Each structure stands twice: as structure tokens, then as C-alpha cells.
Amino acid sequence: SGFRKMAFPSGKVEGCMVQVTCGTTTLNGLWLDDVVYCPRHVICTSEDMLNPNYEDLLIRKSNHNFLVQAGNVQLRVIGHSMQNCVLKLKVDTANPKTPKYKFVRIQPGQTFSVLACYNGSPSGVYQCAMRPNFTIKGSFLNGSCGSVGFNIDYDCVSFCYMHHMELPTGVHAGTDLEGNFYGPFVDRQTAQAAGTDTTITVNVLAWLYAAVINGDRWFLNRFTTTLNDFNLVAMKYNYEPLTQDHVDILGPLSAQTGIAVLDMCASLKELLQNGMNGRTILGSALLEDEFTPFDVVRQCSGVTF
Amino acid sequence: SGFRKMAFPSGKVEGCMVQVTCGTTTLNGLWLDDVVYCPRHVICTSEDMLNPNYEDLLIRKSNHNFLVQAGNVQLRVIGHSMQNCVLKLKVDTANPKTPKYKFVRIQPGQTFSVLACYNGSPSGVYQCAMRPNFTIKGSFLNGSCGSVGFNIDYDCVSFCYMHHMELPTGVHAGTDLEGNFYGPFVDRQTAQAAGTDTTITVNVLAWLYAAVINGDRWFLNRFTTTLNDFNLVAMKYNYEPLTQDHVDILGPLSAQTGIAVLDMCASLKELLQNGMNGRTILGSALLEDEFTPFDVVRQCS
Ligand SMILES: *[C@H](O)[C@H](C[C@@H]1CCNC1=O)NC(=O)[C@@H]1[C@H]2CCC[C@H]2CN1C(=O)[C@@H](NC(=O)OC(C)(C)C)C(C)C
Ligand SMILES: *[C@H](O)[C@H](C[C@@H]1CCNC1=O)NC(=O)[C@@H]1[C@H]2CCC[C@H]2CN1C(=O)[C@@H](NC(=O)OC(C)(C)C)C(C)C
Ligand SMILES: [Cl-]
Ligand SMILES: [Cl-]
Ligand SMILES: [Cl-]
Ligand SMILES: [Cl-]
Ligand code: NA
């Protein structure tokens, strides 16, 4: 028993992290097969960042302007190209530690593990959710760019995030590994802000199921509701709408616990309308929304990789 | 900026996890050089578990009674010995992935990462703390025994915990890697219960300093306190005493923020008295006590 915020084991990703330096800027790259991926803003000076013409800045650069280090070993850059907001550096050596992998783009509400890195060296791992406002609530300092987010399935690493920027509220923005930003953000020193966020309803329900599985049941009640009625409450409390597909995804947890999704929605309704009355759920006084239904099933059943 | 419950990257430990089977029992082992460390209860049957005589049970085992599997490879056991509550299985092949490592026994309040494993394969990694009552608040199912806790400050793995059992309140108990239990627990199916737990005061103070570093000031106040008056108040809320050692270790964070340690203690006093009144601190509506002063400096700097 027990329920913790759990990250994927990070070993398959640690073997891919390298250091990339261009000019006076150092950050991290991801070395897969014979390519290193990193944020394209590595090529900018502070003045360039105010209004970069990345196209034009890059033709100015040569292979030798990029210094790539895997541990203490330098990798020779033999080509370079840009894909959206990601720079691709072709190297002369294929990474012998390349795992089975693919590049995926995640949807808001989905979770992933972040391997925070500095100077090409992994320093910590934690679990995040892509917020509805397309930011993540990360923990990142100077030199963290190029750190990546990922999930694992059986033996396949799905890379979904590369870190680029911190917004003024202290939350974080980045791209998929094809260099497309999550959210309406740009890699430029110009005014930008996180939008108003919402709570990920289907994940709150998943966590309430995790709580019931772990013996926390005080918030259960005799009542049920309808998808229509609950979604009016959700809108009132800046919760994301709950869709029939969400209800179906939670089906396994409903059968396991005896609490239908709309039965649990009536519990959530009363928690939103009345608070927790001084009590806690799985050690929290807030409603937690960064566990997905799949996260709950995987942790409560011991899935391995 | 930002502040998260951050574990160490697990790869150096993933490369050490193996599966150990004896009889019908399977759990995890830690393969370092030519030795596999695992909980000695792997040799027990159901009938044995109430009052096992581990010395008598082990003398009856042959090396070939232990099935050790590293991924798809069976490792050959060539010797075995018991150290306290850990079994050390000597194997014919040294682990080529053995990292730089040491064994450390930790004190209550210390934090570490746990790599939860089943059948020798990793499932996930999370952060824990040794509670004042010598339990940890883990996430562990059947088959998780032999999963380990560790820190990796610098490039050296410090192994500090091996998992053995779950207590009736749903918390967890285990040993250091020399096989000595944390707390008064024993690897026997006899009635046992954790003591009343308390809150790790020095860690709450560290986390309040983290909140100030990240730009929060709403909980600060114009007051200070003596150390003894703070402890008299804090203990009424089942907080651990704050010692001069703790005041000293908070010095660097005090210096960085410009808030004297006993000034922050007066903030904590007021928070215990008032609550948060609908506010949060670093995304929490409860006072968090599983970040140490060392952890705050690691993550914020
Ligand atoms: C890459 O290592 C770095 C990561 C940052 C450093 C602090 N925490 C992080 O997450 N990224 C940057 O330094 C980026 C850089 C590319 C986009 C524009 C450049 C500045 N920047 C930032 O993250 C700053 N944020 C902003 O300037 O935000 C606005 C553009 C909205 C003003 C941050 C360092 C204040
Ligand atoms: C090893 O894989 C396993 C881990 C457990 C399983 C559920 N969650 C865990 O953390 N450990 C055990 O099964 C141990 C075993 C060795 C000590 C005695 C045996 C039972 N046990 C337990 O964890 C049980 N707990 C108790 O029996 O607790 C008392 C000894 C206090 C009665 C648990 C399975 C109920
Ligand atoms: Cl909380
Ligand atoms: Cl292995
Ligand atoms: Cl310690
Ligand atoms: Cl150390
Ligand atoms: Na109900």
C-alpha cells in the first residue's frame, strides 16, 4: 500500500544526455543515434534574443561552432539543421546507449517524468503534468534548457518535452522533440505570460479512486449525478469538462471499487462546494490533479519496465 | 525557479537490480561487484515466519537453492552468508555496471530516493524521508522487498535503505545495507506497531526558506522567539524538538534570505496557530517536512 508521486526510472534517458556549448551559452542536448537535439536558442546572443532571425543566425554558424561533450568525450559535429524550435546536430558517432524510442506529442492533462540536467549531467527526476494552459510546473535553473520529459512503455522511451523557458509566474514552457511549442509561446525575449489555468478533472477523479483503494473513504456519499449537471459545477470551479471518453477511461477503477464515475463526481461536487472540513485525502489538503487514470493503475498494480 | 519533490536519477541503481528466488518466494536483490544483497526473509516459508530461526534455516540451504536472475541471465551462487537481517549471496560474476558506492546508515529526518522494483525490474522512483518513528511512507506492493533507497550526491551512490515489510498503518520498515533495522522492528510476523509519528521541524523550516527563495513572504512576521519557547509551543503540535544543531545547519539558508533562524521559527509558530487561510506555500496547503536543508540548497542552487 501507499501512493506517491512516482517518476519513471530514468536510466535509459541518462545515457542520452550530453553538453552542448555555442559561444558563451551552455545547455543540454539529447543524443540519439547520430544526432544531438537541443533548443535552437543556444545560437543567440542576448541582443539576438530580443528579435532573433534564427534562419539567418544559423547560416552564420559552422559545425565547429558547436562543442558537444558526452561525459568527458567530445563528439565531432558534422552537420547542422533546424526543425522548428529545435536544433539538430549530426555527430560522427552513434550513441551506443540509444534506447528504443520515439517522439510523441502529449495532450494537456497527460503526465511525464522530467530529467533535470545541468552541463550535460543528470541532476534530478520528477513527475509533471502538461497543464491545460500548456505550461508545466517544473523546477528549473540557469543551464537547464535541453532537459527532457518522457514516458516509458514496456521498453520504449517516448520523449515528449524539451525545456526552453521560464515564464514570469515561475512556471515553464518548452517544445516537443520536433520543436513545436506547447502553448502559444515563442523562443524570444518578448513579453509573454501563462494563461489562466484550470484543474484536470479526470485526474482528480483518478486520484480519488487511488485514495479509496488505499482506505481513504470519508468523502464518499450515497449520491450520484449526471455528466451534464456535473459539468455545470466544473465550469463554476474552473475545472476542465469531463467527457464521456474520460468516464470510459475510468471504467476499470469504477468496477474495482464499486464507485461509478458519476457517483464519484457527486463526491467531488460536494468537496468543491463544501471543502474538506479539516480532513485530508492521501496526505493532501488540496485536490491533486497530476495523476492520470493510467498512473493510478500502473502504480497500484506494480507495472515494471 | 519552482520547487518539486525531486529524486536522484535512478540509472546507477537500475543497473544493480536483480531477481532472487528461494523456494516459492521471489523478491529483489542488489548486485554490487560479486555479491547480491537481499532480505533474509527470502528463505522463510509461511509456517516459518512467526518465529524463524534464520541461522537454522540458512544452514539447510545449498547455493543451488538460490535462483538469481539478472535480466535474462541466471547468475550462479557460489556462497552465502547472513549479516543481521540481510543475506549476502556470492555469485560467480561481478556486476559490470557496479557504480561507485558506499553504505550509509541515516538518521530520522534524512531523505532519500527509492527505486521501487518487482521481479528485479524497476517500476518507478520517488522521494522518501526517514520518519522520527523510524518508518517511511512508501509505495510498496507484494514482491517489492529488496528495493533500495539511496542518494547520489556527487557521483557516488550512498545506499541507505533496503525494504522488508509493511506495518498495519500502511507505512514501511526496513534495514540499512548492513542488515540492521531502522527502529525497533524485526523480520518476524509477530505483532508490531509504529510509534506515534511527529513532524520533522528542521525540514519544515528549510521548506519555508525555500518558499522565501522562490518569492513568498506572506507568512513572515515581525516577531522572534527564544529556542526554548519555540520548542514548548511546537511540541504541543507533535513537532519534533529543534536543537542547536538544527539552528546551526539552517545558518546558510538564513544568510541567503536575510531571515534569522529564530525569526523563521516565529513564522512557523504563527502558521501552526492560524493555518494558511486559503493560501498555499510552494503549492501545498499543509506544512511539508520531507525536504531537508541540504535538499533545499541542492535544488534552489
Ligand atoms: C535555458 O537554460 C533557460 C532556462 C531558464 C533559466 C531559469 N529557469 C529556466 O527555466 N532559458 C532561458 O534562459 C530563456 C531564454 C530563451 C527564451 C528567452 C530567453 C530567456 N529565458 C527565460 O527562461 C527567461 N524568461 C523570460 O525572459 O521570459 C519572458 C520571455 C516571458 C520575458 C528567464 C531566465 C527569466
Ligand atoms: C516483501 O516483498 C514484502 C513487502 C510488503 C508486501 C506488501 N507491502 C509491503 O511492503 N514483505 C512482507 O511480506 C513482510 C514479510 C517479512 C516480514 C514478515 C512478513 C510479512 N510482511 C509484511 O510486510 C506484512 N506485514 C506484517 O506481517 O506486519 C506485522 C509483522 C506487523 C504483523 C504485510 C504483507 C501485511
Ligand atoms: Cl496539500
Ligand atoms: Cl541487471
Ligand atoms: Cl543522516
Ligand atoms: Cl556522499
Ligand atoms: Na456518491
DSSP for B21-73? Answer: EETTEEEEEEEETTEEEEEGGGG--TTTSSS--HHHHHHT--GGGEEEEETTE
In angstroms, the CA B237 to CA B130 distance is: 19
Q: Return d(Cα B252, Cα A122) in angstroms, integer.
A: 25
d(CA B189, CA B168): 12
Instruction: Decide if A75 contacts A132 (C-beta within 8 A).
Output: no
User: Distance from CA of residue A25 to its chain's centroid?
Assistant: 24
- Beta bridge pairs of residue A220: none
Q: Which helix (H) or strand (E) holds B86?
A: strand B86-91
Residue B21 has phi, psi (to 5 degrees) of -125, 135
A-chain residues near B285 (CB < 8 A): 284-286
B194 in ligand 2 pocket by Cβ < 6 Å?
no
Residue spans of alpha helices (H) in A133-260: 201-213, 227-236, 244-249, 251-257
A chain contacts of residue B215, beta-carbon cutoff 8 Å: 170
Chains A–B, number of C-beta pairs less than 8 Å apart: 136
C-alpha span between B218 and B201 (Å, rounded): 20
Distance A270 CA to ligand 7 centre (A): 9
CA distance B37 to A61: 53
Q: Tell me the C-alpha distance between A186 and A39, whole Å.
A: 12
Question: CB of A108 within 8 A of CB of A58?
Answer: no
Alpha helices in chain B (DSSP H): 11-14, 54-59, 201-213, 227-235, 244-249, 251-257, 261-274, 293-300
Q: Is B41 annotated in the active site?
A: yes
Enter the C-alpha cell of residue B282: 510552494
Residues of A in contact with B274 (CB under 8 A): none
> In chain A, what are the helix, strand and coil shares in percent, each to the nearest 5?
25, 30, 45
- Tell me which of B44, B145, B160, B265 is the catalytic residue: B145
Residues 6+ apart with CB under 8 A from A155: A99, A100, A305
For the purposes of burial, counting CB atoms within 10 Å of the CB of B47, is it exposed (0-12), middle (13-18) or buried (19 or more)? exposed
The residue length of chain B stands at 301
Determine contact, residues B170/B193, Cβ cutoff 8 Å.
no
Q: Give the integer Cα–Cα distance in Å for A91 and A89.
A: 6
Backbone angles phi, psi at B3, to 5 degrees: -150, 120
Backbone phi, then psi, for B130, in 5-degree steps?
Answer: -75, 115
Q: Which residues of A are catalytic?
A: 41, 145
Count Cβ atoms within 10 A of the Cβ of residue A51 and give its class: 0-12 exposed, 13-18 middle, 19 or more buried: exposed
CA-wise closest residue to B77 among B25, B117, B16, B22:
B22
**Which residues on chain B are in Cβ contact (under 8 Å) with A9?**
10-11, 14, 115, 122-125
Q: From atom 1 of ligand 1, which residue's Cα is the shortest distance away?
A: A145
Pairing of strands B157-166, B101-103: parallel
End-to-end CA distance of chain B, in Å? 10
User: What distance in Å separates residue A15's CA from the closest CA in chain B?
Assistant: 9
d(CA A88, CA A90): 6
Please report how many Cα atoms fall inside a 13 Å half-sphere around the Cα of residue A249, on the Cβ side: 16
Within 10 A of B295 (CB to CB), how many other CB atoms are there? 21
Task: Quote the CA–CA distance of B88 and B34 in Å, as a whole number.
Answer: 10
Q: Which of B26, B165, B169, B188 to mutate to test the pocket of ligand 2 (most atoms within 8 A of CB)?
A: B165
Residue A206 near residue A293 (C-beta atoms within 8 A): yes
**Measured CA distances, B111 to A163, B7, B292 (Å):** 27, 10, 7
Phi (first) and psi of residue B90, to 5 degrees = -80, 130
Containing B75, the helix (H) or strand (E) segment is: strand B73-75
Distance, CA of B114 to CA of A8 (rounded, Å): 12
Q: Distance between CA B208 and CA B60 in Å, rounded?
A: 55
State the nearest Cα–Cα gap between B161 and chain A, in angstroms.
17
Helices (H) and strands (E) in chain B, counts: 8, 13
Which among A42, A147, A166, A171 is the best mutation to test ligand 1's pocket, defined by most ligand atoms within 8 Å of the CB? Answer: A166
Amino acid at B79: G
Strand order in the sheet with A25-32: A73-75, A66-70, A17-22, A25-32, A35-39, A86-91, A77-83
Give the max Cα distance, chain A: 69
Phi, psi of B187, rounded to the nearest 5 degrees: -85, 65
Rounded distance between C-alpha atoms, residue B111 and residue B253, angstroms: 18
Q: Residue type at A123?
A: S
- Which residue is closest in CA terms to ligand 1's atom 6? A142
Distance from C-alpha of A55 to C-alpha of A83, rounded to nearest angstrom: 11
Q: How much is the CA Rg of chain A, to the nearest whole Å?
A: 22
CB count, 10 Å around CB of B106? 17
Take atom 35 of ligand 1 and give the residue whose Cα is closest: A166
The two beta strands, A172-175 and B66-70, are: unpaired
Written as one letter, the residue type at B199 is T
Residue A202: which residues within 8 A CB-CB, separation 6 or more? A109, A240, A242, A246, A249, A250, A292, A293
Are the beta carbons of B38 and B20 closer than 8 angstroms? yes
Rounded Cα distance between A170 and B298, Å, is 18
Q: Which residues contact A242 (CB under 8 A, 6 or more apart)?
A: A201, A202, A205, A227, A230, A231, A234, A265
Distance CA B149, CA B147 (A): 7
Interatomic CA distance for residues A59 and A67, integer angstroms? 17
Residue B103 has a CB neighbour count (10 Å cut-off) of 14
Is the four-CA dihedral B37, B191, B196, A276 of positive or negative sign?
positive
Q: CA B158 to CA B151: how far, in whole Å?
A: 5
* φ, ψ for residue A213, nearest 5 deg: -55, -35
